[PDB]
Design a protein around this ligand. Sequence first.
Ligand SMILES: CC(C)(COP(=O)(O)OP(=O)(O)OC[C@H]1O[C@@H](n2cnc3c(N)ncnc32)[C@H](O)[C@@H]1OP(=O)(O)O)[C@@H](O)C(=O)NCCC(=O)NCCS
Ligand SMILES: CC(C)(COP(=O)(O)OP(=O)(O)OC[C@H]1O[C@@H](n2cnc3c(N)ncnc32)[C@H](O)[C@@H]1OP(=O)(O)O)[C@@H](O)C(=O)NCCC(=O)NCCS
Lengths: 375, 363
Amino acid sequence: SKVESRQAAVLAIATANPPNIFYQADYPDFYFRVTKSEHMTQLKDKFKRMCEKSMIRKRHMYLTEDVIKENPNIGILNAPSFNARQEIMVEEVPKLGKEAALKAIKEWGQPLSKLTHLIFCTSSGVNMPSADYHLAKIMGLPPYVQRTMIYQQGCFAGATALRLAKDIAENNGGHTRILIVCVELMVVCFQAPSDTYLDLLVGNAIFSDGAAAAIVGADLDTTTERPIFNIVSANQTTIPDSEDGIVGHIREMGMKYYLSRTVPQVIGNNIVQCCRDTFDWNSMFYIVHPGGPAVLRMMEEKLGLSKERMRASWHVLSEYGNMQGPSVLFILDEMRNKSMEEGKSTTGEGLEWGVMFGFGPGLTVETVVLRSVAI
Amino acid sequence: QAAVLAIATANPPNIFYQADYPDFYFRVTKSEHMTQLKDKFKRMCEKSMIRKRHMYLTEDVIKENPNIGILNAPSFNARQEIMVEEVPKLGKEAALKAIKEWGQPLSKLTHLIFCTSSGVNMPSADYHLAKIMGLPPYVQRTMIYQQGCFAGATALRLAKDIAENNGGHTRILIVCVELMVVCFQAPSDTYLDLLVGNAIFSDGAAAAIVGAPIFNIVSANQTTIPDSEDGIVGHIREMGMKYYLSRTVPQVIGNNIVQCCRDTFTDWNSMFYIVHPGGPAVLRMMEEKLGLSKERMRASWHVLSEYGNMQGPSVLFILDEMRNKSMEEGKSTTGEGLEWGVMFGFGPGLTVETVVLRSVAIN
Ligand SMILES: CC(C)(COP(=O)(O)OP(=O)(O)OC[C@H]1O[C@@H](n2cnc3c(N)ncnc32)[C@H](O)[C@@H]1OP(=O)(O)O)[C@@H](O)C(=O)NCCC(=O)NCCS
Ligand SMILES: CC(C)(COP(=O)(O)OP(=O)(O)OC[C@H]1O[C@@H](n2cnc3c(N)ncnc32)[C@H](O)[C@@H]1OP(=O)(O)O)[C@@H](O)C(=O)NCCC(=O)NCCS
């Protein structure tokens, strides 16, 4: 189609995670032990129950027990540890982003010199110059790669990078190729347990580390690049009077995340709306940010979805946890790879139209209308 | 094609005349016995070409938050709590004035781009602005955090592609705010980088509306200068932001943007210029390498004189001053009677944002 030819497409996807794996079944014992809080028995039971119903099987994490032993204020509640967290993240966030971006560029199959833009997203550390510059340096990007840095936008940053990339790619022409890199390291917000701050306990059961990279461009060269998905449209909306749903406070003791109990119902109730406002509900594919099991379940129940509609998102939640920014790109990668391994008609599990939802502080919702490519 | 449809500015009300500032700075930090350091600071202020600066951080705000004035003391939480509230409030004052000049309803906006290097929060300053302004829930927000002094030009580069790819109903509000609460530091004889920043950095907010007119955004491009990473460095720490400014930055910058002019534009006094007022030497390099007459840099010199180095929003102040004086003094276009112009923002990297502009006819 000429319609599909003129429009921004995703040309490659790849992911990376830190090497140390933490199985959720052992995490309550480890979490309450390295923070030296084993005497908070009632709290540990409450946290145990939290990890069991989190539908997370394993998480990858840079913050190991050895790194807590070298930066022990990170494991001591209210203690000054912001400088220690910053030093790690300013170094490690771009490195892990390089691991994922090298793989994405290998799939795209073009030289570094054909990149024109870089969009870097992270809520893990802040610096001047920022992680976008540091990524460009350690990858040897040319001086003409135009950088955009998306700091602290939480779990909708991956979706928002695609909204920006679509307008950049389409308005400057077929030369324009955007590299998107989203990285999260839970060094930023790890906090020791306390019965005063029950809103922080949930985050230590779900948040994890990972990096995803993608290439976006329009007007593709019909011999080197082929699209995995086309970005049809992308729109951000804000839920009125919900600012206290997800709150991140960056402090001398690191970041203090506050997660309201009602976020999954409010998000789930809103994204079901967006689906309807934007588009049989089993005839399209879905990428939902695995904020919690309750959001994915509400999609299924309120839209009457089969089990296979949400499978890629349940999957990334189980194998990686809540990685914030990059998570929707892990699910996009997981959907297309299984679609090809199982020989389905399209990269969207055999279907044509699809939606991607990111959401986070605000509450903010990013909705990306997608379309498969035939396999 | 994308155009600037309105521009307005705001500043904190407290004025600090530069002639008084070495005395004030060393007094409120209880460092006046550091007499040789203070004489070095005096020479820096006296050569800055800054006449006055507007600043949120007054003596009273230091007294309320004493650790801001004690070198190395933990003051990050105190700084954060001021800025998360005060940055969007200052931005609101500028945005309301820009929407008023525009003449269209606030509800006709479709996008908000907020830029600041002063404070970080979730949700961020862009949400807080939308909240205190009552922007409708359909306004699509983008937050540009910690990009230094090229943030204002970078927002124009993004706004151009958003306005042009979405149609004619797309209207983007750009808001850039800086408060030096973020990086104010007490003097030390072993950290001379702070001495520079305390002589030049100041507070302000600017707002612009973009749609696809006062100027037309012909093109915009970012580039990075190799082997210059350590020229402008910002380290956000428990003591607040710790900046490091290389003495060679104005020469690396000035030689680069002089070269950007040459490569991009294909008589130098026949175009107009907006140069981020990083300091006097960058402006003097433009004048000297391009053989510019004295009126070319007048608007950039004027903003430096009357506001200091406000980082992100500075180029919009200069753009506003240029078109305002162009109208009042009876020039034939918004760019001082000239047709083509260029805006240069720059900051950590070193990163350069180049925006090719075009004026519109007035009387
Ligand atoms: C494990 C998890 C994923 C699912 O838990 P759940 O089964 O839906 O909730 P349950 O009622 O079954 O029990 C969870 C326990 O943790 C408590 N809890 C759950 N959410 C809480 C919250 N935001 N704040 C404080 N306590 C909370 C509950 O009170 C409950 O305690 P109890 O059963 O011991 O009395 C949970 O961590 C969760 O859902 N968190 C919300 C996810 C979210 O908000 N993501 C934001 C998108 S970035
Ligand atoms: C401070 C400023 C007034 C420059 O002053 P100047 O024209 O160089 O005047 P001088 O060369 O005589 O130097 C004055 C004093 O300031 C010192 N100084 C100037 N820049 C310095 C720097 N980056 N670091 C440490 N010391 C510096 C000089 O060592 C000198 O000390 P001395 O009087 O004891 O001998 C200001 O215009 C400036 O520094 N601009 C560039 C700063 C920058 O990097 N901006 C980019 C961020 S947007």
